Design an enzyme around this catalytic site. Structure first.
Site, PDB file in Angstrom:
ATOM      1  N   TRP A   1       3.410 -22.837  34.174  1.00  0.00           N
ATOM      2  CA  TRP A   1       4.576 -23.755  35.069  1.00  0.00           C
ATOM      3  C   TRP A   1       5.351 -24.656  34.292  1.00  0.00           C
ATOM      4  O   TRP A   1       6.302 -25.143  35.062  1.00  0.00           O
ATOM      5  CB  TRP A   1       3.667 -24.351  36.186  1.00  0.00           C
ATOM      6  CG  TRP A   1       2.673 -25.058  35.750  1.00  0.00           C
ATOM      7  CD1 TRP A   1       1.144 -24.714  35.943  1.00  0.00           C
ATOM      8  CD2 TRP A   1       2.705 -26.391  35.129  1.00  0.00           C
ATOM      9  NE1 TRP A   1       0.306 -25.709  35.574  1.00  0.00           N
ATOM     10  CE2 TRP A   1       1.318 -26.732  34.894  1.00  0.00           C
ATOM     11  CE3 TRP A   1       3.434 -27.306  34.836  1.00  0.00           C
ATOM     12  CZ2 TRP A   1       0.831 -27.883  34.588  1.00  0.00           C
ATOM     13  CZ3 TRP A   1       3.366 -28.346  34.289  1.00  0.00           C
ATOM     14  CH2 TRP A   1       2.155 -28.809  34.303  1.00  0.00           C
TER      15      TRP A   1
ATOM     16  N   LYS B   1       2.423 -12.111  35.172  1.00  0.00           N
ATOM     17  CA  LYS B   1       1.969 -12.937  36.046  1.00  0.00           C
ATOM     18  C   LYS B   1       2.611 -14.218  35.935  1.00  0.00           C
ATOM     19  O   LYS B   1       1.907 -15.032  35.127  1.00  0.00           O
ATOM     20  CB  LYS B   1       0.399 -13.051  36.246  1.00  0.00           C
ATOM     21  CG  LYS B   1       0.111 -13.109  37.532  1.00  0.00           C
ATOM     22  CD  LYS B   1      -0.931 -14.456  37.914  1.00  0.00           C
ATOM     23  CE  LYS B   1      -0.414 -15.666  37.099  1.00  0.00           C
ATOM     24  NZ  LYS B   1      -0.809 -16.719  38.277  1.00  0.00           N
TER      25      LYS B   1
ATOM     26  N   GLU C   1       1.571 -19.628  39.689  1.00  0.00           N
ATOM     27  CA  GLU C   1       1.662 -19.773  41.186  1.00  0.00           C
ATOM     28  C   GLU C   1       2.612 -20.804  41.590  1.00  0.00           C
ATOM     29  O   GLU C   1       3.313 -20.967  42.572  1.00  0.00           O
ATOM     30  CB  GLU C   1       0.289 -20.058  41.803  1.00  0.00           C
ATOM     31  CG  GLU C   1      -0.394 -21.188  41.087  1.00  0.00           C
ATOM     32  CD  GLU C   1      -1.652 -20.614  40.114  1.00  0.00           C
ATOM     33  OE1 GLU C   1      -1.350 -19.740  39.128  1.00  0.00           O
ATOM     34  OE2 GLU C   1      -3.121 -20.383  40.349  1.00  0.00           O
TER      35      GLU C   1
ATOM     36  N   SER D   1      -4.723 -23.219  29.805  1.00  0.00           N
ATOM     37  CA  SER D   1      -5.619 -24.251  29.559  1.00  0.00           C
ATOM     38  C   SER D   1      -6.795 -23.413  28.667  1.00  0.00           C
ATOM     39  O   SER D   1      -7.002 -22.288  28.763  1.00  0.00           O
ATOM     40  CB  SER D   1      -6.372 -24.941  30.603  1.00  0.00           C
ATOM     41  OG  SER D   1      -7.158 -24.035  31.283  1.00  0.00           O
TER      42      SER D   1
ATOM     43  N   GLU E   1      -2.539 -19.139  23.541  1.00  0.00           N
ATOM     44  CA  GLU E   1      -1.817 -20.434  23.432  1.00  0.00           C
ATOM     45  C   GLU E   1      -2.446 -21.273  24.118  1.00  0.00           C
ATOM     46  O   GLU E   1      -2.064 -21.286  25.485  1.00  0.00           O
ATOM     47  CB  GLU E   1      -0.347 -20.074  23.592  1.00  0.00           C
ATOM     48  CG  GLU E   1       0.327 -19.202  22.421  1.00  0.00           C
ATOM     49  CD  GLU E   1       0.766 -19.554  21.073  1.00  0.00           C
ATOM     50  OE1 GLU E   1       0.926 -20.779  20.911  1.00  0.00           O
ATOM     51  OE2 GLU E   1       1.068 -18.711  20.186  1.00  0.00           O
ATOM     52  N   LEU E   2      -3.067 -22.235  23.895  1.00  0.00           N
ATOM     53  CA  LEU E   2      -3.858 -23.127  24.682  1.00  0.00           C
ATOM     54  C   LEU E   2      -3.431 -24.515  24.833  1.00  0.00           C
ATOM     55  O   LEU E   2      -2.452 -24.997  24.360  1.00  0.00           O
ATOM     56  CB  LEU E   2      -5.377 -22.865  24.462  1.00  0.00           C
ATOM     57  CG  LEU E   2      -5.884 -21.219  24.585  1.00  0.00           C
ATOM     58  CD1 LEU E   2      -7.179 -20.932  24.005  1.00  0.00           C
ATOM     59  CD2 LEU E   2      -5.637 -20.735  25.904  1.00  0.00           C
ATOM     60  N   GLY E   3      -4.478 -25.359  25.024  1.00  0.00           N
ATOM     61  CA  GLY E   3      -4.068 -26.962  24.898  1.00  0.00           C
ATOM     62  C   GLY E   3      -4.087 -27.559  23.486  1.00  0.00           C
ATOM     63  O   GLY E   3      -4.278 -26.918  22.598  1.00  0.00           O
TER      64      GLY E   3
ATOM     65  N   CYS F   1       1.854 -28.453  25.909  1.00  0.00           N
ATOM     66  CA  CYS F   1       0.697 -28.041  25.072  1.00  0.00           C
ATOM     67  C   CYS F   1       0.935 -28.854  23.646  1.00  0.00           C
ATOM     68  O   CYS F   1      -0.279 -29.405  23.263  1.00  0.00           O
ATOM     69  CB  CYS F   1       0.715 -26.590  24.938  1.00  0.00           C
ATOM     70  SG  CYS F   1       2.057 -26.307  24.178  1.00  0.00           S
TER      71      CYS F   1
ATOM     72  N   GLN G   1      -2.406 -31.960  39.137  1.00  0.00           N
ATOM     73  CA  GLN G   1      -2.082 -32.517  37.724  1.00  0.00           C
ATOM     74  C   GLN G   1      -1.895 -34.345  38.009  1.00  0.00           C
ATOM     75  O   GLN G   1      -2.637 -34.842  37.217  1.00  0.00           O
ATOM     76  CB  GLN G   1      -0.721 -32.128  37.506  1.00  0.00           C
ATOM     77  CG  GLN G   1      -0.902 -30.851  36.944  1.00  0.00           C
ATOM     78  CD  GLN G   1      -1.908 -30.471  35.893  1.00  0.00           C
ATOM     79  OE1 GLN G   1      -2.918 -29.734  35.917  1.00  0.00           O
ATOM     80  NE2 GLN G   1      -1.919 -31.370  34.559  1.00  0.00           N
TER      81      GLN G   1
ATOM     82  N   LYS H   1      -5.330 -35.787  38.235  1.00  0.00           N
ATOM     83  CA  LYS H   1      -6.025 -35.866  36.971  1.00  0.00           C
ATOM     84  C   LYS H   1      -5.223 -36.745  35.948  1.00  0.00           C
ATOM     85  O   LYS H   1      -6.188 -37.725  35.325  1.00  0.00           O
ATOM     86  CB  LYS H   1      -5.683 -34.373  36.251  1.00  0.00           C
ATOM     87  CG  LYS H   1      -6.187 -34.316  34.913  1.00  0.00           C
ATOM     88  CD  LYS H   1      -6.228 -32.876  34.413  1.00  0.00           C
ATOM     89  CE  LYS H   1      -6.188 -32.858  33.000  1.00  0.00           C
ATOM     90  NZ  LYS H   1      -5.897 -31.650  32.090  1.00  0.00           N
TER      91      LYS H   1
ATOM     92  N   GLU I   1      -6.890 -33.574  27.172  1.00  0.00           N
ATOM     93  CA  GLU I   1      -5.715 -33.401  27.115  1.00  0.00           C
ATOM     94  C   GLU I   1      -5.138 -33.901  28.495  1.00  0.00           C
ATOM     95  O   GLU I   1      -5.782 -33.636  29.533  1.00  0.00           O
ATOM     96  CB  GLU I   1      -5.406 -31.800  27.217  1.00  0.00           C
ATOM     97  CG  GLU I   1      -4.071 -31.484  27.403  1.00  0.00           C
ATOM     98  CD  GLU I   1      -3.683 -30.103  27.055  1.00  0.00           C
ATOM     99  OE1 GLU I   1      -4.280 -29.219  27.701  1.00  0.00           O
ATOM    100  OE2 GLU I   1      -2.892 -29.856  26.224  1.00  0.00           O
ATOM    101  N   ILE I   2      -4.146 -34.759  28.431  1.00  0.00           N
ATOM    102  CA  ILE I   2      -3.734 -35.651  29.847  1.00  0.00           C
ATOM    103  C   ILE I   2      -2.613 -34.797  30.525  1.00  0.00           C
ATOM    104  O   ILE I   2      -2.820 -34.459  31.842  1.00  0.00           O
ATOM    105  CB  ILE I   2      -3.348 -36.946  29.493  1.00  0.00           C
ATOM    106  CG1 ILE I   2      -4.322 -37.986  28.997  1.00  0.00           C
ATOM    107  CG2 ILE I   2      -2.912 -37.639  30.615  1.00  0.00           C
ATOM    108  CD1 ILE I   2      -4.165 -39.012  28.038  1.00  0.00           C
TER     109      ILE I   2
END
Ligand SMILES: CCN(CC)c1ccc2c(C)cc(=O)oc2c1
Ligand SMILES: CCN(CC)c1ccc2c(C)cc(=O)oc2c1
Ligand SMILES: CCN(CC)c1ccc2c(C)cc(=O)oc2c1
Ligand SMILES: CCN(CC)c1ccc2c(C)cc(=O)oc2c1
Ligand SMILES: [Cl-]
Ligand SMILES: [Cl-]
Ligand SMILES: [Cl-]
Ligand SMILES: [Cl-]
Ligand SMILES: [Yb+3]
Ligand SMILES: [Yb+3]
Lengths: 494, 493, 494, 493
Positions: C162, C186, C189, C240, C262-264, C296, C343, C346, C393-394
């Site tokens: 997103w 996909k 959301e 994530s 491809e992640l955090g 990221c 978010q 968090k 990861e913030i």
């Protein structure tokens, strides 16, 4: 005929190899290793488990540290160490071929002429790549200098099968080490001995301690420990699709380690009416029966155009009845045993399903003797796509022959499987050879031959036969991790 | 096949330097003709050494470190080339018409083949601009080594009259994609389409001096390019004889890099198992396309004995169906030769064929009262020592020969100083692969002929050429490799 | 220059896109999509789930069939279709930037000038590769002709985040389509709308039906269906690390589909005493605060040499206090909202942990305003390695600044994480720049800059920040499946 | 430093063709000398045109389709090259001794550098043999297109006297790895080590005719190679002047492919922030290595004003530490120049420096009673128009100059027809990258000089060369690309 070992093979190396030293298992446990032709126990080997894997990974991690000899030596020197290792294997060729034959149930002539030669050549090929692995300089938008480094990944866990123990060992360590990785190797429980001899040569060649570590043991213990280890960067596995799935799952659950898999197949051949018939018969035969059918690439579905089908079957049956079963060290023997009782049982069971489901048994179809695990070379004709023998990987000397009339339909039938390791196409026609090979969902397609594998070409599966490619230029990519470095500059010029 | 609805007006006739139009320094001009009608289309400024010198200075300045062309993003060089392609597409009718009229080129081929080829080639080249990459190298010792694939610099490019627009693009596309600047000398016979393209280069937004175009003659303007002390590279397509002189002048002057695409005497080998109609059709196309005026012309067709008579018969039937006339006229299927010099040379070679005992199966002379038309001509029973079997004809003249031994015919096919291309006709896999491997030719076609694309490298073996054009490989020849080796305190893999 | 949309944005595309047609969800269910600056509902979108995914996969499979338009068209024509798509996006740039801003909480100027330009340029880059993807001819041992085909893999499931909905959409589909794959996409959301507009342009461009399919919906439903689907050949996911693990696990459990992730990150910067201090402050600031910290690659640990630490902090704080928070469509606003309440919560929780664990709060440290999810730009100094804000990861506008004295030690601290997406190095010294960038375990290392990403360079993570690389030449490899074709010949010649 | 325990006996003195030793056709022989002592070592068969013709016929035959060399596995070509490297390693003492005696080369450098470079280069090249690959190409239309990177054929290779063994390997290594056959002409001054290597080529098991070695003079044997009608490619390392003649003869004869590695006048740019001792040391090594007899000699050292005086001071101190004498004598650190012609040319250029007002800091004349020894010489306050600033000296003569403007000194560094290499000394990232990018030189060293390895391409910009040697990129120049395009009924991606 070929040279042989003039003295009796003495088994010397039976322990866990870590930091260029020999270690007992942490538990003290050992496991027996057998000759599958005779059922005799050859020796006991240290039984590595999680704790032994942990020691090996620490050693591999330490050897991979920034500033270590392995990280700081010239790429050309990694190459030189690999070349030296090849020379040492060549020196010990008689010993290794004999050991491979005895432990692996492998015909000695094949062990000496094919397996050992394949090992040596593959290592020499890999050696040559070490100082020819290169990144890029990239003309990125903006006032920047951008380059890439193709670094080694790090600690690579490598799980090796029993069917080609020496060749598969080299297929794994060769590219890994050429790229600058360190490795933790888990040879098959059935066949650890040649790997441990190679470890003695790794030390002799002068590899730094911890660069190569070898942990014999079982799959669900040592193999699982590798696949779930939090400090292993990459796992490579060759073996069954079922275990492949579990490795990939454990990689995801643990530390997202990179994964390469070379798994089963149910590889088809398509034989057109215009094919050189003898050549097709001979390659399809070799494709199924080589090493007692114990090849991932076995040509286990042969589709033959109607007009030549009966003759194809006839010649295939004639070719299959010529074998002499026995001890693979015995001159005159042309078929050895299956690796163990579990495989033997599974093969006999699938042969029974073939009979039961109405395939036509043309020859063989049962065991041979009680001593060791020998299966008569077996040919089934009139096989249909829904039969178990048409769907399931047999891994034994069992050939399936089927007919087709429509080329379009037989391509669909060939592709209608979750497997996709390889395939064969037999025709003299240019257009057919190209268009059929393009349409087949298989990682290697052979044209007018079968089972031709070389260090120069990438090898691996489509679909559930694998993830990634081994060997050739392309296979090297999977043992590197790409780093992009982007440097701000005051002004760029083309 | 759309056509130009209005009469073609010739507008661009001058020397193009720094995105501006210049008269020749001498004031001299030369006439340009329609080879179908012999009418003079216009006069064009006659560039010579002094005009070349101005162009080179402009190209040198545009190549200077810190200049817009050197400092712009590689992707933007690409964007400019894509834009140029769009403009040529916009002016496709005009350009095809001009190319047809000036070049004696069938309009349908000009529109459908030449213009499409031009546009596609430019778009292909545009895509490479930001994908040209050097290497990082794991050198021995404590060093960081990388390479830059820099543009070479000022490239002099000499273009032939047979495919003026396509060849223009074949040259400038890769040169510019790589970041070079260029000085282009179009053929004396056919400068007009290049000068229209120059107007589009300006419109597209290329910086001044990046492309310069100097019309003129070979021994004057072309020689000036080849001996120029501040040109870094020369590329030439044309005759082998002139190729030799270019390479010699390069050596004598400043050791400029040289790429050459020269003549051929390209063979076809037709085996007994070939699809006969397909072979007849492709060999025919191979020799007769654009009135035979192709470096790759299929000018020696070797046919296995058992199918030879039938091959000849079908080839003759195919050759007798042409309609000669003005290449702008619908229904015309063969245009004129480019000029009187070529026409004369072709008629002379046809005469040698008759004199040396080749069998004349059809044609064999001129046609008509105006323009340079040669009847499509087929010779059979040609032998290897005949002039028509050795010399490049560059006209609608087909040679057919027999063989019985495959080993021997390969030797015969290879027994030439030329080596541009070849064709192999067979259904057999093994024959196709082993024959194509044994032929000393830069492109080998299997069951086809004359299939050229921007994606594949093209060029000659032996005296048919030095270097390759297009594809990934062709781009190498427009770069100069610089190795940068940096001392560091300690390296890690 | 900043043009704006002169008409009010009308949301037109809200359905599932399969076979170039618009479909209601199989269940009939829809889900709301919001403006995060105002909390207002923009529209309802069809809620895709497993059954919708299944329809999309069948369409993608059919479009990938041998002999189909997509498989048989010229590679150059795939490229042409991609270039045409780029032109259409350029035509609709105002509409798309406005929609991206409204739905994503993304500063309009950044949406228009950065995201949309990045999309267009990336697509054009990818278009140029289509007919330049090449295999090899290989001088294998023996009398054989061997070549390789770099085929498309097949049906690729692509799961988009997103934070950069449009750019990430293109990053995925550009290379996949350029290589000849078909896709099932996909979108997140939170942000499906721009993707659905791009689908309308895919149809307009002339892509064959089924080549691109888009299924909006939730992660645990539609996303999970993609990752466990038995007829999807590959899955690509950006998001994530936690979800990445579940995707890789489901790939292993289902059909061994290829996986790119491809992640955090928890990306470090190392600022040496000789650095251009203003440049380092500015890039580290941009690195953390760009798009409200929702990257990221956020520069979330800034290590500064002791002698310049206090001055670095001071200048960083001055820079962080200049923002104007509000609606990202409002001229003059320089910081938008966080994407959603989850978010936002968090981020505030992690800010609280920082205060609680003794980090020094230099500025910000709480929410802002009466509507939407705004967090004050926040700077913490004296951060230590064991604090939550140093480890987790913030994904918010929260900067951590730390000191070091020993270069060797700070490299260890920078590397002491399971993450490894990127890093920054700030120094004027050649040797330091090269040796530090080599030692850092990160996929991209920036020198004297930060966050410089381009279509020309490969991008991806070391360790648990990712598997594989996206974009550049290297990234294209991951959208091809290599087939080796080996042809028997009578004799080879070099 | 091991040494040869026995006296070197010269055994191989003949022309090597088809793995056999031949007398010259004419019967003539030429003397070969020790440049340190002026004593005659032996007589060697004097190859000329007729001997070249025999060698070329042998090379052509060995290259024929179906021959062992063409049909063997690429990996086996590699194995032969690895075996050759092992044999050179076995004979390392002998070869180093011979190289030192004949070449006037310091023994320690011959043993530690030249021989090691030879062995490593060969092993590098061996590894490429089975990794040379063509492409499969997604061409427009219903076609299957692939390329073969074939060997070119018969390659004539002309080798210089400064690094006889290394240069021999630099040529034959890549040529043979790619599958070519070669005709090698070593320098008249230094044929002996090449002839010993030929004995090893035979011992290694290379088929006859794959490598042929023809000793002789430049204008006779070298010219015969360059103008030969059946040589496909010529590679030459030597003077720019002869390079021009080779390229000219290539153009005049059969348009053979040409690679050239020629002279230089390579600049260094030393910035005020440089590690000064490192810069002094590398610039010194760069100019004085092997008595200044390196194409890459760092022969123009531009130093920023503020550090200029100190740079000169330290350079002079470094230059005064040498011991001149026989290069086989332990303790000697500078050998002789190769011959009287070079010696004379160097002394003449040193005189021009004095005459034109350069400041002589040390040396400046000959040394000793026998052999061709020149004192290590440093000139400061050198200006761009002096002969010593323009002409390649090829002796132990260092030129030091000052600059203040970086932009201007880049122009000065680039203001030459040469472009072989350059050096940049700075600690600053941005300067290192932007200066190296702006220099018109084939190799740019940063904070080092003269770092050459088999892994990296090497060659000149402008008149310092055509093409590249070694690395991945260098291998291209020993292949000829063939495109094969096959018609198919339908393609799929
Ligand atoms: C064949 C024996 N089995 C049981 C499924 C297993 C199960 C898991 C593994 C794993 C993870 C690695 C391995 O090497 O072998 C295994 C073997
Ligand atoms: C065809 C007319 N002739 C005379 C051989 C020439 C001679 C030399 C050149 C040169 C050097 C360049 C050129 O473009 O055309 C020429 C043409
Ligand atoms: C948002 C966190 N959750 C729920 C546990 C998940 C879990 C799994 C997935 C999967 C497999 C794909 C996905 O796209 O999103 C997810 C989201
Ligand atoms: C340096 C001596 N000279 C001038 C007569 C030459 C002249 C020509 C050549 C040629 C063509 C090849 C060569 O190897 O050496 C030469 C040397
Ligand atoms: Cl890369
Ligand atoms: Cl390179
Ligand atoms: Cl490949
Ligand atoms: Cl190629
Ligand atoms: Yb007239
Ligand atoms: Yb809380």
């Amino acid at each position: 005929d070929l040279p042989v070992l003039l003295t009796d093979l003495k088994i010397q190396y039976t322990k866990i190899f870590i930091n260029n030293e020999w270690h007992d298992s942490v538990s003290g446990k050992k496991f027996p290793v057998f000759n599958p032709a005779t059922e005799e126990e050859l020796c006991q080997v240290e039984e590595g488990d999680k704790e032994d894997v942990d020691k090996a990974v620490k050693a591999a991690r330490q050897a991979f540290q920034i500033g270590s000899p392995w990280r700081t030596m010239d790429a050309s020197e990694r190459g030189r160490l690999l070349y030296k290792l090849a020379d040492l294997i060549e020196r010990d060729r008689l010993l290794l071929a004999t050991m491979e034959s005895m432990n692996g149930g492998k015909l000695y002539s094949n062990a000496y002429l094919n397996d050992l030669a394949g090992c040596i050549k593959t290592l020499r090929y890999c050696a040559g790549w070490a100082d020819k692995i290169q990144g890029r300089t990239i003309p990125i938008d903006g006032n920047f200098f951008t380059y890439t480094r193709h670094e080694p990944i790090g600690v690579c866990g490598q799980i090796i099968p029993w069917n080609f123990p020496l060749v598969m060992l080299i297929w794994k360590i060769g590219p890994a080490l050429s790229c600058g990785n360190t490795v933790v190797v888990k040879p098959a429980e059935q066949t650890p001995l040649t790997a441990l001899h190679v470890a003695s040569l790794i030390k002799e060649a002068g590899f730094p301690p911890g660069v190569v570590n070898i942990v014999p043991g079982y799959g669900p213990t040592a193999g699982a420990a590798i696949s779930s280890h939090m400090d292993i960067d990459k796992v490579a596995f060759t073996g069954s699709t079922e275990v492949g799935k579990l490795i990939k799952e454990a990689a995801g659950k643990s530390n997202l380690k990179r994964v390469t898999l070379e798994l089963g197949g149910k590889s088809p051949c398509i034989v057109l009416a215009d094919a050189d018939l003898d050549n097709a018969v001979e390659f399809a035969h070799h494709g199924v029966f080589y090493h007692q059918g114990q090849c991932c690439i076995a040509a286990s579905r042969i589709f033959v155009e109607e007009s030549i089908y009966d003759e194809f079957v006839r010649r295939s049956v004639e070719r299959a009845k010529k074998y002499i079963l026995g001890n693979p060290l015995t001159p005159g023997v042309t078929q050895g045993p299956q690796i163990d009782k579990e495989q033997y049982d599974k093969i006999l069971d699938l042969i029974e399903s073939g009979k039961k489901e109405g395939a036509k048994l043309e020859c063989g179809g049962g065991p041979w003797g009680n001593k060791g695990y020998f299966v008569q070379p077996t040919v089934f004709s009139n096989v249909t796509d829904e039969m178990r023998i048409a769907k399931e990987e047999i891994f034994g000397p069992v050939q399936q022959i089927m007919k087709f009339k429509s080329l379009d339909d037989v391509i669909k039938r060939a592709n209608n499987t979750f497997y996709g390791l390889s395939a064969g196409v037999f025709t003299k026609d240019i257009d057919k050879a190209i268009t059929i090979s393009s349409a087949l969902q298989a990682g290697t397609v052979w044209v007018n031959c079968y089972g031709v594998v070389s260090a120069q070409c990438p090898f691996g599966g489509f679909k559930m036969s694998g993830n990634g490619r081994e060997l050739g230029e392309y296979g090297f990519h999977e043992y590197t991790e790409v780093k992009t470095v982007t440097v701000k500059i005051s002004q760029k010029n083309s």
